[PDB]
Write a protein that binds this DNA or RNA. Structure first.
Lengths: 95, 93, 107, 590, 86, 98, 82, 93, 107
DNA sequence: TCAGGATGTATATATCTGACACGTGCCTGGAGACTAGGGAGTAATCCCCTTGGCGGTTAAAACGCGGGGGACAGCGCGTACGTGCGTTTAAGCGGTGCTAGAGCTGTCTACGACCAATTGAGCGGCCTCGGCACCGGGATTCTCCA
DNA sequence: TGGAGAATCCCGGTGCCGAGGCCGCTCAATTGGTCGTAGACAGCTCTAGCACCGCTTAAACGCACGTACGCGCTGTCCCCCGCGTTTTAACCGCCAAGGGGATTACTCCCTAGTCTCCAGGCACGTGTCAGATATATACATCCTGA
């Protein structure tokens, strides 16, 4: 049994070394169609449209987690908490 | 020489909304800048909308879509309402 | 015949003719339709009315009768949608909204 | 005699790389200002800045890295000094052929550079003050390693970083001594050094109460005429602006005087350097020829051709001397028991090279010296510890008393000084201050310019002085003035020749005319000479060796011209630390 | 003629996926309350972008949302995207 | 016994006083000289309209005030009331200025 | 004439007045220097751009419009100066 | 339809820089997007410069100033160098 | 008679004629000078070369011979000025820079 | 601190493919030549607005010194988060079938550019008085040691 | 918990200077034509988006267990605030010069519009080797132990 944290760094290196998408594709496609349902009914999507949405979304979340990690280290923690996300988004100008 | 502005129009609207209120010089400068800035934003967005669809004309559809893109929520709803009202009044005449 | 300004046909205060000229000379597109300046003038007039109403109320809450940049600042920053529209805009001589964070207050 | 006895490599003629000047060669009048030309400038503040640069050169470890690459223009611009006026500074310099206005560096050069030079000069002032006074903790303290003062120390939030050392200085200075320019020079022309102020002896005590002892130790005593400083208000050291503003709050000449006095006081009372210098000079050794204050490298004082000729004669003589040394009766009989390891390796390799060098032709006799200097170094162990043509800049004995900006001596004229930069310990990567062989080697690489500005600043060009100037020091006039009655209180003995490449070539053009021997001896160097530049040296045979030395100086200066314009263009190309990767991407892209 | 109404697909952004997204961001330890916050954030981002994409679609009188619509929406929000045309 | 306010009361009083007013908080002449000193590097012997300097000062003060608001949020996040240089650096890094 | 050390004219009390308007209650002693640096950078960015407009118009005077255009280029639209 | 792109030109420049390196199709798509983006930015800024100075022409002065305003530091210096070089070669020949 | 492209006259690989057409058809100004397409093509070609060189280096370091988006991403983010020029751009399939905060490292 | 065992990792060989590189027709768009006319460049002028001085005043900045309170370090606990393992689920991949709607073409008319005549709305000039800034003196509130 | 002193509010009075109204006088908006083509509109082809089914199997999920991290508490001491006193330079009101920005009248050459021609670039076919996968190997790291 590894000490809690070794697998964490090993995964960090793994997922920073690759470039593939990190969310399942069907769930995300269903999420996209569900959200769009409230602006126009019976909408069709090009497949590349959904893929573009997923690329943009994942890039956005990764950058948000980088800022979250900085805000956590600022308060002398290592665990990121909802306060960190809220502070990051408040400084960015999103809230 | 001459220097055109939006002052008298802003003052007219003011007299319609608060009949007994004035406005400073610097406040009028701010409102003139605000009108220019919003005009430029909407016109630029309409220009892009025309270019995307391979059109060479800016119509009321372009302005309506640009308004929907730039203004938030209730501002957009009411703005489209007033714009459509004005266009209908203009054509029906 | 007797001339009626385009802005009076549509029942507006802003100039339809001036807006149409600005559109033509701005190189926004090759051609400008007949309804575009009317529609855009209506929108500009609506937004101006919004700002001026809120700022007039703000000025009245100070027992003043001239609107000054401070009142425009208070009007904009106290309305969520106008504040979203003008989030990247600085109003000269505006100041800020009075706001002191809770954990700074005496206890 | 015994075996053609080892020809004594006498130290008097066969010194190390270091000869001397003996400071009395020009016992005969040489005051004539004949070398003058349009490109001459009288610079009163010159020797002072030379003293500053030499001091900062000898004390590299004490000072910031940014202070080690200073040049003479850096001092001028930082202190806002202009050459020309023998009464101080010639406010402004004219531009072009004719000029109603004057250049005034703000009108001439980029302004961040002026700011940066001024910042360097405040940094130097603060570093000297720190090294002088932060000695309650003497030398080694909490901030021991590195220079005592750095940029963030100067740019710190103390905001009056100079105030406390200023107070300390105005305290200890009244007795540490003031410069002759800052002495209260006498209005009353009666209290001179040898005489005294006031007649304290009311009368001589001729009627002694004890006739048995007529002798008296108080014939006629006075009040003492000890020289005074200025009033506190007129003592520029008491100008309050120095607290915040720094050194840039005096007169430019007062800036110079204060820096000089601070260097003297640092050298005397900075007990760190105070003991370090006396350690370095009078350690357990005397000079390989004998104590003399000022000394030079050999190739400086005679020149390349004469020194290599005489050391070729020396080389042949001492090679035959080695051959004698081995095959010597007593030496041979003491060799079989292993007398010294040098006395065997030297002898064996010297025999094999006697075989390989008597093979060498007389045309190769000259070239073998410069080719075999590499293995020739380990030879000189039983002989002098250094080669007669060796590196001066590797000694701890010829370090305190050595002056390195000196570039040559000429009879009846004076000396040519080349104040360029630091070359001691650090910034030796491309230091032109080095042995003759590798010196001429590097100058050669820069005639054909195998190294250019990009390699030039890669090879510590930023630690290397970007610019330079050339000076003539009238040793004969000042030496005679000292020996004859000290006419000097503010007289000038330094003159400026050439600050950049174009003026360097102009000076070469004018000096080669001096190298023209007097064929006007058999007359009946150019026209309009008695009016702007005395080209024809007095027709006689005095200047013949002087002109050989002038020929070698012309050679050395033309050899320099390549590397000197190289730096003078490298600075312009890469004054700022910049990503030159993109700059070379320009060339690869085109 | 099948037009179903989806419900609660936001839970398909599973907790392991959020941990992977955090791991690519350099995060070592993750609170348990992070997941709901992240789903809310993602929902807001997608709503903002899709509203603009569908506006562009409607203006062109189309019924499919194209890749250009998404690209234009993102550019309009200052999040330019490379690799899909435009 | 001379009367003294507790440390912090006058600070709050000033917070209210300066959040109520709208005038500029930097002296005019020093800021004008700062503008000219900065502009030396780009072109020599520039002239400035008076309104140009006023515009620069309005924009500058607005920028610093907003930056201090973000800085204060960071300080509160770390469970402090004193703002520190690292708070400014974190704010400017999150914003995208460093 | 050279200009130097003008950033020291942004005094400590002026900085703390700006901090007060920002709602800051206690201020560390190292803030001031840091703040000055920040200000310098900001101005260097906008003034640079402003001069770029002035040079392009072949003028020798920096107008308020040049500043407004520079600010707007950086995403900091300013109302009230034309 | 003959949809245009910068594919072959980017390929040419690549062969000049690294004579024996290929490029993916997705990477070609990205580089095409990059060229279009920078073209749009520079052209828009030059347009604003022209409108500001009440001029109806985009000359190389406008392009130069737009490049100075848009590119950071050394990139701007080098790009201006290249542009000036190219215009000189074009006119002198 | 024999045609000789404007791009060839200026020693460029990018098209001067196509850039001139895009300028004329894009509604940027009423008229377009002669040297503007030349200058703009030169700038675009230079920036392309700049990014492609760095991407080629990055791909070479990974023992690849074809460039993929990962290498474009690495080239851009590892350079200060290119990163400033594309600070608000997402490169599809680019990944991130390998970077772990020091305090998180074990000890 | 040195080390051994287990594990994840950098290393080395084999094969397997499909994505990139290489190679023909054709057609559209770039090049050449040419003319016109208006945008842009130049010279002359004038006036206003920016820079630089001067002296008085006083508000703000600087400096110094308690001392109170917040930043910070150290410690202890307890619960939430990571790690592992078996069981369940649904993503992914392929194949099949279908039709909505994207995308292109061809007609043709209604809308917008353009232009000359006419005019009336809005701009610059010029007064004038009232809203607001300021002051001074009294009222009320707020903060801090009891 | 109640009072003493400092801050702030408030009411009345006074003065000024800018907001707001009036008045010519352009010159930009409006009206009424003609002229061309941009886009509305109908119609057709065929791509690709949608739905469904089946089989693999990797990822998601649930639970168990343990320890590491977060958070609360305490104590220390340094460092910033509050206030007094000295010092300095900002600000204001006035004055003067002169540089540079704006206006005006010519002049000319550069760019658009047009027509003709042909080849550069793109769509469409073909090969093969760079990279991914598999599979077998020594190397470095982690965790526990002496």
């Amino acid at each position: 049994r590894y000490r809690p944290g070794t697998v964490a760094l090993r995964e960090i290196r793994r997922y920073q070394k690759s470039t593939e998408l990190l969310i399942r594709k069907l769930p995300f496609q269903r999420l996209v169609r569900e959200i769009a349902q409230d602006f126009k009914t019976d909408l069709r999507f090009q497949s590349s449209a959904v893929m573009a949405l997923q690329e943009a979304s994942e890039a956005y979340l990764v950058a948000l987690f980088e800022d979250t990690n900085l805000c956590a280290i600022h308060a002398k923690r290592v665990t990121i908490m909802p306060k960190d996300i809220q502070l990051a988004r408040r400084i960015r100008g999103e809230r | 020489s001459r220097k055109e502005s939006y002052a008298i129009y802003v003052y007219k609207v003011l007299k319609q909304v608060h009949p007994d209120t004035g406005i400073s010089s610097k406040a009028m400068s701010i409102m003139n800048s605000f009108v220019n800035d919003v005009f430029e934003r909407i016109a630029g967005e309409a220009s892009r909308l025309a270019h995307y669809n391979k059109r060479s004309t800016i119509t009321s559809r372009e302005i309506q879509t640009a308004v929907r893109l730039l203004l938030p929520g209730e501002l957009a709803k009411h703005a489209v309402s007033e714009g459509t009202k004005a266009v209908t009044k203009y054509t029906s005449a | 015949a007797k001339a009626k300004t385009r802005s009076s046909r549509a029942g507006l205060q802003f100039p339809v003719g001036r807006v149409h000229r600005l559109l033509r000379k701005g190189n926004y597109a090759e051609r400008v339709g007949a309804g575009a300046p009317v529609y855009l003038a209506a929108v500009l007039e609506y937004l101006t009315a919004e700002i001026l109403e809120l700022a007039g109320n703000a000025a009245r809450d100070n027992k003043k009768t001239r609107i000054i940049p401070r009142h425009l600042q208070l009007a904009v920053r106290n309305d969520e949608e106008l504040n979203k529209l003008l989030g990247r805009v600085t109003i000269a001589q505006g100041g800020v909204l009075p706001n002191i964070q809770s954990v700074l207050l005496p206890k | 005699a015994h075996e053609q006895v080892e020809p004594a490599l006498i130290p008097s003629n066969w010194t190390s790389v270091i000869p001397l000047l003996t400071s009395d060669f020009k016992n005969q009048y040489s005051v004539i200002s004949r070398l003058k030309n349009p490109n001459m400038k009288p610079v009163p503040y010159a020797g002072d800045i030379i003293k500053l640069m030499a001091f900062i050169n000898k004390f590299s470890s004490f000072f910031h890295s940014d202070l080690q690459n200073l040049s003479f223009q850096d001092f001028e611009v930082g202190l806002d000094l202009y050459p020309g006026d023998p009464n101080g500074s010639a406010a402004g310099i004219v531009k072009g052929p004719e000029d109603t206005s004057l250049l005034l560096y703000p009108d001439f050069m980029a302004i961040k550079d002026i700011v940066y030079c001024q910042d360097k000069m405040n940094l130097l002032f603060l570093s000297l003050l720190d090294l002088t006074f932060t000695e309650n903790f003497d030398g080694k303290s909490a901030k021991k390693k590195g220079p005592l003062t750095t940029w963030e120390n100067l740019k710190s939030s103390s905001k009056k970083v100079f105030s406390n050392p200023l107070y300390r200085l105005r305290l200890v200075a009244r007795e540490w001594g003031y410069p002759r320019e800052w002495r209260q020079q006498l209005p009353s022309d009666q209290d001179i050094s040898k005489p005294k102020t006031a007649l304290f002896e009311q009368d001589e005590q001729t009627p002694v109460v004890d006739p048995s002892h007529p002798e008296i130790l108080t014939p006629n005593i006075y009040t003492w005429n000890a020289n005074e400083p200025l009033p506190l208000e007129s003592n520029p050291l008491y100008n309050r602006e120095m607290d915040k503003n720094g050194i840039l709050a005096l007169k430019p000449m007062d800036r110079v005087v204060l820096l000089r006095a601070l260097t003297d006081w640092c050298a005397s009372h900075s007990s760190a350097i105070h003991d370090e210098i006396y350690k370095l000079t009078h350690g357990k050794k005397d000079p390989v020829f004998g104590i003399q204050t000022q000394q030079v490298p050999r190739y400086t004082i005679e020149g390349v051709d004469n020194t290599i000729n005489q050391f070729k004669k020396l080389c042949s003589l001492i090679q035959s001397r080695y051959e004698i040394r081995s095959k010597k009766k007593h030496f041979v009989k003491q060799l079989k028991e292993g007398k010294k390891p040098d006395l065997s390796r030297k002898l064996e390799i010297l025999k094999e090279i006697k075989a390989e060098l008597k093979n060498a032709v007389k045309s190769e006799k000259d070239e073998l010296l410069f080719s075999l200097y590499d293995k020739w170094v380990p030879l000189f162990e039983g002989e002098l510890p250094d080669q007669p043509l060796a590196n001066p800049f590797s000694e701890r004995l010829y370090k305190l008393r050595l002056q390195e900006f000196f570039l040559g001596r000429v009879p009846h004229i004076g000396d040519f000084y080349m104040p360029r930069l630091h070359s001691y310990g650090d910034s030796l990567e491309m230091s032109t201050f080095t042995d003759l062989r590798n010196l001429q080697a590097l100058l050669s690489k820069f005639k054909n310019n195998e190294y250019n500005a990009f390699t030039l600043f890669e090879n510590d060009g930023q630690s290397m002085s970007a610019q330079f100037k050339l000076f003539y020091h009238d040793t004969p006039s000042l030496a005679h003035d000292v020996a004859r009655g000290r006419n000097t209180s503010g007289k000038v003995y330094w003159y400026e020749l050439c600050h950049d490449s174009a003026t360097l070539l102009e000076f070469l053009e004018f000096l080669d005319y001096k190298i023209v021997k007097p064929q006007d001896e058999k007359k009946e160097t150019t026209d309009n000479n008695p009016s702007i530049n005395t080209n024809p040296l007095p027709k006689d045979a005095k200047y013949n060796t002087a002109r050989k030395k002038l020929q070698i100086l012309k050679e050395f200066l033309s050899d320099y011209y390549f590397i000197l314009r190289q730096f003078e263009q490298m600075k312009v190309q890469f004054a700022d630390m910049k990503p030159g990767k993109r700059q070379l991407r320009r060339i690869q892209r085109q | 003629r099948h037009r179903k109404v989806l419900r609660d697909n936001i839970q398909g952004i599973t907790k392991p996926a959020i941990r992977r997204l955090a791991r690519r961001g350099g995060v070592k330890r993750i609170s348990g309350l992070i997941y709901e916050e992240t789903r809310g954030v993602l929902k807001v981002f997608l709503e903002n972008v899709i509203r603009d994409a569908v506006t562009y679609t409607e203006h062109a009188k189309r019924k499919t949302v194209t890749a250009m619509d998404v690209v234009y929406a993102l550019k309009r929000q200052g999040r330019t995207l490379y690799g899909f045309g435009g």
